[PDB]
From Swiss-Prot, chains A, B, C, D:
Stretches the record annotates as Leucine-zipper: 4-25
UniProt source species: Saccharomyces cerevisiae (strain ATCC 204508 / S288c)
Annotated gene: GCN4
PTM info: Phosphorylated by the cyclin-CDK PCL5-PHO85.
Protein name: General control transcription factor GCN4
Disulfide bond entries: none
Length: 31, 31, 31, 31
């Protein structure tokens, strides 16, 4: 269960790179 | 194209909301 | 904790609409 | 544009992998 709670944070971090990346996509699509 | 952008903006907003959801399950479990 | 385990599934389902939607975007970007 | 598509394909593959990650935390907790 700190097993769980720390995978959950790794998932968080990856979800944030993802959001960074859709936003950058969105920025290109826009130029 | 304004419609691809609008979707991307809306995907991001559903991401961010899942990110909040998840950080809170992280909260809980750390209890 | 079935509280937790069922939010986790709602999150799953939303992550799947998301993937459906990036793929459809990707399909438009491609025509 | 082939590069937007390639990214989108790669975001989706990181999603799908988070989806698997999460369904398994769901597994665990249902124990």
């Amino acid at each position: 269960m700190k097993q769980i709670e720390d995978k959950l944070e790794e998932i968080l971090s990856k979800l944030h790179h993802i959001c960074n990346e859709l936003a950058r996509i969105k920025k290109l699509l826009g130029e």
